[PDB]
Design a protein around this motif. Structure first.
Motif, PDB file in Angstrom:
ATOM      1  N   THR A  90      40.347  47.184  37.332  1.00  0.00           N
ATOM      2  CA  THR A  90      40.901  47.766  38.530  1.00  0.00           C
ATOM      3  C   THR A  90      42.383  47.411  38.634  1.00  0.00           C
ATOM      4  O   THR A  90      42.851  46.400  38.046  1.00  0.00           O
ATOM      5  N   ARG A  91      43.148  48.220  39.388  1.00  0.00           N
ATOM      6  CA  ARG A  91      44.524  47.882  39.728  1.00  0.00           C
ATOM      7  C   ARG A  91      44.652  47.076  41.019  1.00  0.00           C
ATOM      8  O   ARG A  91      45.723  46.513  41.325  1.00  0.00           O
ATOM      9  N   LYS A 101      38.610  41.774  37.239  1.00  0.00           N
ATOM     10  CA  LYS A 101      40.031  41.984  37.477  1.00  0.00           C
ATOM     11  C   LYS A 101      40.625  43.031  36.538  1.00  0.00           C
ATOM     12  O   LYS A 101      41.470  43.861  36.955  1.00  0.00           O
ATOM     13  N   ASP A 102      40.137  42.988  35.298  1.00  0.00           N
ATOM     14  CA  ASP A 102      40.631  43.925  34.296  1.00  0.00           C
ATOM     15  C   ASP A 102      40.106  45.352  34.458  1.00  0.00           C
ATOM     16  O   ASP A 102      40.550  46.242  33.696  1.00  0.00           O
TER      17      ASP A 102
HETATM   18 CA   LIG Z   1      43.663  44.556  36.995  1.00  0.00          CA
END
Ligand SMILES: [Ca+2]
Ligand code: NA
Lengths: 10, 252, 28
Positions: B170-171, B167-168
């Motif tokens: 990518t946007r 998750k960290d």
């Molecule tokens: Ca993210």
């Protein structure tokens, strides 16, 4: 670039 | 596949090539799950932002291949499509959530040394194997680099990554229908899927029953083999109720 | 019944060149 495939498939 | 290696003969006998009829070209990967059913990513067949919307007669599937460009006489088999089924909740507008599609072949394909189906996971398979650090295997004839093309099928083994790390990186909003895999910068080993590999399988070999299961479908990534980026894969088990619904309703 | 068992590998008890890397990762 791709080798042609047998006509029966098209 | 970037930073992979040549497959061995018969190493991935469930590998399928999706082939555009005219112009004759590689569209994506796919996988054989029975004598009449092929699994792929929905974005290989439907992606409106690029005016992609294929119908059955636009495509062929080539099974049993090793060489990318060769017609592998007496080894490969070429099958026509009866019908395409895309997940009804495939989210092409936002993040490719539920990136999965099924293709029913017009006739059954004969299995051989080079053509054989992969298993689909059940709930316990997924619980046992889909864990951070556990490795799976991605195969394809896609590009060797982000910016050429392989002579033969490529293979790379890659670890599943912790969800907060995915998750960290990518946007994009990551859903429970996705997982990510790849090495971290600091692990120093490398590898990723790349253009042309989409739709192909992410497989794991169960150490319990010695069978290969397709845990993922190559879905998307931000470039290829970039440090700090990961590949994202459709979580096959999470979408299995749909898979079974379609085969139960339309299989023969 | 035979899904996931490859004719040239599992159904000859031959291992491919890197499957052991996968097995070694399934530690725990
Ligand atoms: Ca993210
Ligand atoms: Na990366």
């Amino acid at each position: 670039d791709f080798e042609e495939i047998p006509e029966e498939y098209l | 596949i970037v930073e992979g290696s040549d497959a061995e003969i018969g190493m991935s006998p469930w590998q399928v090539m999706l082939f555009r009829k005219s112009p004759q070209e590689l569209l994506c990967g796919a996988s054989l799950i029975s004598d009449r059913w092929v699994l792929t990513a929905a974005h290989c067949l439907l992606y409106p932002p690029w005016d992609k919307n294929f119908t059955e007669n636009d495509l062929l599937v080539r099974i049993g291949k090793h060489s990318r460009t060769r017609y592998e006489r007496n080894i490969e088999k070429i099958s026509m499509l009866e019908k395409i089924y895309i997940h009804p909740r495939y989210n092409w507008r936002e993040n490719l959530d539920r990136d999965i599609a099924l293709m029913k072949l017009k006739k059954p394909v004969a299995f051989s040394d080079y053509i054989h189906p992969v298993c689909l996971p059940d709930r316990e398979t997924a619980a046992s194997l889909l864990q951070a650090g556990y490795k799976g295997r991605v195969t394809g004839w896609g590009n060797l680099k982000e910016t050429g093309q392989p002579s033969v099928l490529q293979v790379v083994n890659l670890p599943i990554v912790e969800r907060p790390v995915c998750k960290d990186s990518t946007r994009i909003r990551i859903t429970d229908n996705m997982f990510c895999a790849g090495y971290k910068p600091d692990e120093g080993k490398r590898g990723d899927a790349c253009e042309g590999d989409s739709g192909g399988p992410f497989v794991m070999k169960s150490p319990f029953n010695n069978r290969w299961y397709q845990m993922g479908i190559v879905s998307w990534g931000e470039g290829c083999d970039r440090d700090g980026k990961y590949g994202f894969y459709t979580h096959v088990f999470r979408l299995k109720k749909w898979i079974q619904k379609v085969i139960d309703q339309f299989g023969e | 019944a035979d899904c996931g068992l490859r004719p040239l590998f599992e159904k000859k008890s031959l291992e491919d060149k890197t499957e052991r890397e996968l097995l070694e990762s399934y530690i725990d």
